[PDB]
Amino acid sequence: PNITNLCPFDEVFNATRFASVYAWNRKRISNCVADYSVLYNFAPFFAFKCYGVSPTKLNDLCFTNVYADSFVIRGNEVSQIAPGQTGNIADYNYKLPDDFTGCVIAWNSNKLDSKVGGNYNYLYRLFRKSNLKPFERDISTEIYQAGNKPCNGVAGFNCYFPLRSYGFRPTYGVGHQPYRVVVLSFELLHAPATVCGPKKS
Amino acid sequence: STIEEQAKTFLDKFNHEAEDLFYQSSLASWNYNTNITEENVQNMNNAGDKWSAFLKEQSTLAQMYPLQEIQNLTVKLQLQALQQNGSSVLSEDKSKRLNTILNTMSTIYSTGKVCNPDNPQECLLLEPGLNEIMANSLDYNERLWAWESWRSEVGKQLRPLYEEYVVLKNEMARANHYEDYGDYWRGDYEVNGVDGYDYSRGQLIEDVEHTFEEIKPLYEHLHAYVRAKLMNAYPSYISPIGCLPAHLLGDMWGRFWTNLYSLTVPFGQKPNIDVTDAMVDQAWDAQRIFKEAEKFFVSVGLPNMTQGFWENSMLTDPGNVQKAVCHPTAWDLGKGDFRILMCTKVTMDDFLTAHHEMGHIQYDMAYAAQPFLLRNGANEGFHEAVGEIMSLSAATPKHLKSIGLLSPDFQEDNETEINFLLKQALTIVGTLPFTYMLEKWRWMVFKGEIPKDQWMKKWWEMKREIVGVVEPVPHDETYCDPASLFHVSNDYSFIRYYTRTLYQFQFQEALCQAAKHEGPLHKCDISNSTEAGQKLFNMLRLGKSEPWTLALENVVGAKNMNVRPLLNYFEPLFTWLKDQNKNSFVGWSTDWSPY
Ligand SMILES: *[C@@H]1O[C@H](CO)[C@@H](O)[C@H](O)[C@H]1NC(C)=O
Ligand SMILES: *[C@@H]1O[C@H](CO)[C@@H](O)[C@H](O)[C@H]1NC(C)=O
Ligand SMILES: *[C@@H]1O[C@H](CO)[C@@H](O)[C@H](O)[C@H]1NC(C)=O
Ligand SMILES: *[C@@H]1O[C@H](CO)[C@@H](O)[C@H](O)[C@H]1NC(C)=O
Ligand SMILES: *[C@@H]1O[C@H](CO)[C@@H](O)[C@H](O)[C@H]1NC(C)=O
Ligand SMILES: *[C@@H]1O[C@H](CO)[C@@H](O)[C@H](O)[C@H]1NC(C)=O
Ligand SMILES: *[C@@H]1O[C@H](CO)[C@@H](O)[C@H](O)[C@H]1NC(C)=O
Numbered sequence: 001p002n003i004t005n006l007c008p009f010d011e012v013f014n015a016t017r018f019a020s021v022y023a024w025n026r027k028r029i030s031n032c033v034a035d036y037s038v039l040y041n042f043a044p045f046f047a048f049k050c051y052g053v054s055p056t057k058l059n060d061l062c063f064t065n066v067y068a069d070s071f072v073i074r075g076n077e078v079s080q081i082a083p084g085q086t087g088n089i090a091d092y093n094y095k096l097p098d099d100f101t102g103c104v105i106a107w108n109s110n111k112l113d114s115k116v117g118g119n120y121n122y123l124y125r126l127f128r129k130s131n132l133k134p135f136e137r138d139i140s141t142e143i144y145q146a147g148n149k150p151c152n153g154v155a156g157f158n159c160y161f162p163l164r165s166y167g168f169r170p171t172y173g174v175g176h177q178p179y180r181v182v183v184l185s186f187e188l189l190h191a192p193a194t195v196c197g198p199k200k201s
Numbered sequence: 202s203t204i205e206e207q208a209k210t211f212l213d214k215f216n217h218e219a220e221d222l223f224y225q226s227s228l229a230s231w232n233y234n235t236n237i238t239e240e241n242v243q244n245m246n247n248a249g250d251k252w253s254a255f256l257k258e259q260s261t262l263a264q265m266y267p268l269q270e271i272q273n274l275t276v277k278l279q280l281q282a283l284q285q286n287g288s289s290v291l292s293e294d295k296s297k298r299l300n301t302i303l304n305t306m307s308t309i310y311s312t313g314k315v316c317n318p319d320n321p322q323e324c325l326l327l328e329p330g331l332n333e334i335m336a337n338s339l340d341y342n343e344r345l346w347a348w349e350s351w352r353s354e355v356g357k358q359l360r361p362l363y364e365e366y367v368v369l370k371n372e373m374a375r376a377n378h379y380e381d382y383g384d385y386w387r388g389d390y391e392v393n394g395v396d397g398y399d400y401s402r403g404q405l406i407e408d409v410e411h412t413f414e415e416i417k418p419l420y421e422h423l424h425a426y427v428r429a430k431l432m433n434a435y436p437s438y439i440s441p442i443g444c445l446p447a448h449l450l451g452d453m454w455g456r457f458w459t460n461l462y463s464l465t466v467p468f469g470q471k472p473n474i475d476v477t478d479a480m481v482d483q484a485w486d487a488q489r490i491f492k493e494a495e496k497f498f499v500s501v502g503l504p505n506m507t508q509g510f511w512e513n514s515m516l517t518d519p520g521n522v523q524k525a526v527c528h529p530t531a532w533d534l535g536k537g538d539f540r541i542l543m544c545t546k547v548t549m550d551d552f553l554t555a556h557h558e559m560g561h562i563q564y565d566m567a568y569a570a571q572p573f574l575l576r577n578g579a580n581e582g583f584h585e586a587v588g589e590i591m592s593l594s595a596a597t598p599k600h601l602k603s604i605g606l607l608s609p610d611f612q613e614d615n616e617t618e619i620n621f622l623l624k625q626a627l628t629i630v631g632t633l634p635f636t637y638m639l640e641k642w643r644w645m646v647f648k649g650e651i652p653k654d655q656w657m658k659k660w661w662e663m664k665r666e667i668v669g670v671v672e673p674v675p676h677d678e679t680y681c682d683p684a685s686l687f688h689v690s691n692d693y694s695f696i697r698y699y700t701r702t703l704y705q706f707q708f709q710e711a712l713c714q715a716a717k718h719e720g721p722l723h724k725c726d727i728s729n730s731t732e733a734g735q736k737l738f739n740m741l742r743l744g745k746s747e748p749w750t751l752a753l754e755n756v757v758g759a760k761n762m763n764v765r766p767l768l769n770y771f772e773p774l775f776t777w778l779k780d781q782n783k784n785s786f787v788g789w790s791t792d793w794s795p796y
Contacts, residue, residue, distance in 0.1 A: 118225075126217065127210065146210045148202070157262055158207055160214050167221050171228070171513055173537015173569075 003198050007034040012068040013042075013105075018113075018180050020123040021071040021093040022163060023139045029066040031194045035059060044107045046179065047078055052101035053186065062196035063186040067102075067135075069094070070182050072113055072122045074166060076175040078106045081183065090132075092125040092162075094183075097134035102185040113178035114170040122166040122178065135185070208266045208276050215259055215283070216573045220535050223573070226252040227534040234542055235515050237524040260284060274394060275746055279574045290376040291369075299369045303692055306362055310690045315351045327351070327453070335453050336460040341438060345673060348448035356680035359690065363681050364653075370692075371647060383644035386694045390580050392748040398760060400750055406644065409696070412703060412764040413637050419768060420634055422778040423626055424669050425787045427458065430465040441786055443794035444671035447664075454686050455670055458631030462624050467777075468616040474598060476606040477548045483605075487516045487545035490552050493604055494559045497595060501727050502734030503563050510539050510562070518544040529554050531561035531588075533576070539566055556595040560588035568744030579740075579749035582700030587741065589705045590712065590727075599726045613724075615773070622723060622774035629702055630771065634668040636699045641667075642683065643695065654678055665791040673796055704753070706766035711757040712737060722770045 007029050019025040036058040040048075053061060073081070073089055080087040083100045090096075113119055127144035140162075143151040147158030155161050168178045229248035233241040263283040271277045288296050315331070316324030325331065334347050370382040379385045384402050392400040424445070431449060432439050439446060451460030480490075491506075499505050519525055525544065532540040539562050545551050564587045568576050578584035594600060601607035642660055645651045651659045657676045660683060664670050676682055684690050706722075713722060716730035727733045740752045750760040757763070768775065 126213065144210075147207055157265065158211075160210070164214075164217050165221075167224075169224070169228075169536070171509060171534075171538050173507055173509060173539070175569075176536045 001199055001201075003033060005032050007032040007066070007195065009034070009038060009068075012070055012182055013039070015070065018070050018072045018109075020121075020166075021073050021089055022123055022125040022137070024069050024071040024094050024137060026137075027068045027070070029068060029195060030064075033198060034066060034195050035198050039105065042107075045105055046075075046108060047104060047106040049082070050103035051083060052099075053103075055103065058103075059197035062193050064189045064191055064193045064195065065187050066195050067185040067187070068182055069185070070180070072109065072166070072178050072180055073124070074168075074176050075108070075179050078179050078181065081106070081181055088124065088126055092128040092132060092138070095132040095134045095136065096183070100134075100185065101187075102183060104181065104183050106179045106181045108174075109178045109180045110170055113180070114168045114172070116170060119168040119178070120165045122168060123163045124166060125162050126164045127160055127162040203270075204266060205271050205273065205276065208271060208280060209273075211263070211266065212276060212279050212572070212574075215263070218255070219259070219573045222252050222255050224535040224538070227532065227538075231532055231534060231540065231542070234526045234530070235519075237526070257289065260286070260289075275572070275575070277394065278746070279572060282574045286377055288373060291373060295369065295372070298365075299373070302362055302366055302369065306359065306366070306684075306690050306692075309355070309358055309362075310687065313351070313355055315347075315354050317346075331453060335448075336451055339434065341435060341449075344448040348453070349673065351453070352676075352680060352682055352685050355685050356676075356682060359684045360679065360681035363684050366692075367646060371649075374647075381644075381647040381649070383647035386696070387644075389694070390700075390749065392750055395748050395751070398748045398750040398754070400748070405696070406641070408762055409637060409640075409699060412699075412762055413633070415764045415768065416630070416633055419771060419775055419778075420630055421669075421787050421789075422775065422782050423630055424789065425782045425785050426778055427461065427465055427627075429782075429785045430461070434464050438796060440795040442790050443792060444665055444669045444789045446796055447670050447672050450670065454635075455668070456632055456635050456686070458627035459624065461627055465623065465627070467620045467623055471614075471616050471620060474596075474601065474607070474617065474621065475549055476552075476601055479606045480547050480549070480552070485547060487543075487547070487551075490545060490547075490555050491516055491541070491559070493552075494556045494595075496604075497556065497591075497600070497728060498559060498563060500729050501737075502731040503738060504566065506559075506562075507537070507539060507566075509537070510541070513538070514540045514542070516541060516543055516545055529558055531558040531565065533562070533565035535573075537569065553592050553596055556591045557588040560591035564588070564741055567738060567741035570742070571744040571746055575745040577745045579743065579745055579747065579752045580700065581694060581697035582704045583740075583749065583752065585697065585701040586704035586708055587737070589701065590708045593705070593709055594712075594725070594727045597724055597726050599724060600728060603726075603728065618721075618723070619774060619777050622771060625723070626771060626774055629767075633699060633702060636695060636702075638663050638667040639683065639686070639689065640696045640699070643689065657682060662791070665789075669789040671793055671795060700762065703762050703764060703767060706770050707753070707757045707759075707763055708737070710766040710769065721773065722766070 012027055036055075040055070048055065071094065077087060077089045079085065080090045081094065081096065081104050083096050083098050113122065125138060127146070128138065129144075132138065142162070143153060143155055144160045144162045145151045145158075146160060149158065151159035166178065226248040229241070229245040233245040260283055263280060266280060268277055268280060268284075271280065288299060291299070314324045314326050331347055331351060335344065338344055367382070374380070374382045374385040377385065379388065387402040387405050390400055390405050391402045392398055428439060428441075428445060431445065432441070435449065439449075447455060451458055495506050515525065518527070526542065527544040528542070530542045532542060534540065541558050541562060543551075543555065543558060545555065561584065564578070564584060598607055598611065598613050602609055602611065642651070642663060646656065657678055657680060661672050661676065664672070687693075688695050709725065710722060712727045712733040713725040715733040715736045716725070716727050718725040736756060740756050743752055743755070754760045
């Protein structure tokens with residue numbers, strides 16, 4: 001069987017523009033052949049930690065849908081993209097379930113996401129009433145009511161705007177440089193699994 | 202829902218905005234300091250203005266949270282730091298007058314030019330020429346002319362300014378629920394709310410007194426020895442029973458005695474431990490000097506330098522075309538950015554200074570995990586103390602033989618140890634009575650213990666009684682003799698040097714017992730000892746989150762200032778000074794018998 005119709009991992013990993021972690025981008029991947037060779041080949045990756053499946057046997061065990069979640073965070077928070085973790089990103093921006101089957105990939109992106117004036121186009125949610133459920137997004141810009149008085153839509157004392165900017169600059173320390181993260185989540189359903197890796201003969 | 206959770210959320214928002222604005226301010230200040238150009242000046246001014254306005258509005262929003270219902274110590278500490286009014290408590294007219302007074306004191310001190318009468322075509326400034334004529338000249342009347350002329354001119358132009366300054370600062374402190382401005386300065390050491398580690402503002406003075414009472418015998422012997430050597434320099438002017446003449450102390454003010462090493466050398470025949478020739482023979486560039494300092498810091502177990510440190514620091518003077526500030530400064534810009542501004546020369550002094558500033562950077566690096574408003578030393582002494590211990594360890598003959606600067610066939614006899622310890626004593630023990638005297642005079646003048654028309658008479662008397670230095674001629678109230686120093690004229694706390702000096706040797710003993718050093722304290726090196734680095738890093742990681750008493754208990758196992766490490770450091774020099782002061786008279790009289 002010849003190999004064709006590869007899954008669009010170039011679209012996710014090599015995108016010119018990633019998303020903020022509060023509005024993290026999710027792309028579904030189906031009805032194609034997914035080869036994980038290209039990802040392993042790529043050297044700059046800071047974390048390639050995988051959960052529930054081995055990285056070596058990605059190409060043979062196959063799944064029904066593959067979700068690629070792309071966002072940008074700061075280096076110190078890359079540890080928060082894992083099951084069972086807490087922080088601003090885990091509680092309010094991007095939550096993984098405790099039974100997460102998939103991989104997390106992160107790499108440094110100074111040359112693409114850092115500006116000398118400061119890149120103010122990457123945002124994160126700092127305040128939220130309750131923790132996020134797994135695989136949930138919140139793109140609401142409602143004023144966070146931290147006190148007892150109603151905010152009435154206007155910020156001020158005890159009423160803060162929840163979205164704060166990741167002001168990335170190239171001279172930051174390694175814990176604060178922009179890191180691009182792609183989370184691959186694999187799921188199996190009752191439908192026939194149509195995302196399967198290459199075959200050899 | 203409660204006040205404490207509101208305070209925590211407010212502090213989170215403040216921490217994010219503060220770190221961004223602080224980074225912009227620090228980057229603009231760095232761009233001015235490494236590149237002195239007018240657009241950089243206005244950029245630094247604009248960023249500083251936005252930072253000051255930001256702290257003004259955040260303190261205004263921060264004072265809406267009362268502290269009596271907050272039980273978490275870290276949140277309470279951050280809110281206490283944030284809610285300080287500063288100079289904002291006054292009226293706008295009085296605040297503007299106070300800033301005008303501080304600015305004009307700064308301009309008078311910076312641009313103070315004093316020169317010879319009858320030759321006014323050009324005149325000499327303090328920093329290029331007066332320092333050289335005070336440190337290098339051996340002529341009595343020349344030093345007398347420079348000393349009297351500078352103090353006369355600066356005192357007459359600064360005395361009413363200080364007269365208004367003490368009243369305005371006293372009103373500022375009393376409006377801020379402090380007893381006096383001295384109490385406001387002593388508030389840096391105040392610890393409240395922690396059981397067993399409580400430290401009062403009022404206690405510091407007796408603690409300083411309690412330490413100085415044990416400083417006093419060693420200093421007396423050193424004073425006697427220095428006096429004897431100055432008798433060799435000046436035959437008839439100095440009395441055996443009296444104090445030292447003020448303009449013979451090697452500096453403009455008598456703060457440091459380190460310029461007297463040539464006159465007061467114990468053994469002139471013995472060579473020094475200067476390794477500059479070894480650096481120039483082996484072509485040690487500034488980059489490799491900092492690499493050697495980094496190797497020292499990874500030997501003790503501390504983390505190595507960041508990549509951004511090597512990329513962004515300017516460790517060499519750039520050239521004639523680009524002007525930069527040559528002062529050695531360690532910069533913590535925030536957001537993981539650490540830099541050193543240093544115009545390095547290939548000398549042993551710059552090598553030791555590089556170790557000192559990298560110690561500053563390591564101290565800044567360790568508390569990066571802390572919240573923004575707690576990213577400082579536990580008190581004002583710790584930050585300089587942790588750099589001075591590195592300067593102590595790097596200057597040892599063992600460390601210089603380890604890294605190849607000093608030959609393995611170098612003989613370390615007792616005579617070179619005595620002269621090295623005397624150089625260290627002139628730098629360290631010499632400044633302690635001057636520092637304690639100056640701070641105690643400032644504390645009483647802020648307290649109102651000293652009457653307004655009795656300042657100079659009191660000050661000189663204490664210089665006779667504490668420092669053992671006599672004035673050349675009597676000075677009336679037309680002079681302002683304290684104000685000739687940089688720190689007092691520009692509103693700086695001065696007790697940090699005394700506390701830093703004590704904490705330096707306390708930390709040195711704690712690290713040397715941690716590293717299992719079996720000899721005298723001055724020979725000790727903390728290199729190749731991971732446990733000593735861990736013991737120090739336990740204090741470094743805390744920052745300002747814990748009381749300074751608790752950090753001191755973490756390092757030395759004591760919660761209070763101790764003078765025993767300092768006297769233990771200078772013990773062989775103390776025995777030697779006791780040996781050679783048999784013929785001379787130890788101690789001084791307050792009479793004007795020398796002059
Ligand atoms: C992205 O671009 C690089 C550039 O050579 C290429 O090697 C790589 O295969 C591309 N795709 C991914 C997923 O990295
Ligand atoms: C220093 O400032 C001048 C201003 O004219 C500029 O031309 C130069 O590039 C600056 N130096 C650096 C290293 O950026
Ligand atoms: C104080 O607050 C910090 C977070 O702001 C928390 O980690 C710490 O446990 C609190 N301390 C106490 C005693 O509750
Ligand atoms: C700061 O000054 C304001 C102005 O009156 C005052 O209400 C407030 O209590 C002061 N804060 C402190 C800590 O003294
Ligand atoms: C600091 O040390 C670590 C290991 O100790 C090393 O991987 C790293 O490259 C060092 N930093 C630099 C700038 O070489
Ligand atoms: C150094 O030690 C020798 C050994 O006996 C002794 O004779 C000499 O007096 C000592 N000198 C000093 C300055 O301690
Ligand atoms: C510290 O360790 C290095 C590497 O083992 C060694 O070369 C050096 O001599 C040691 N320092 C001392 C003072 O022994």
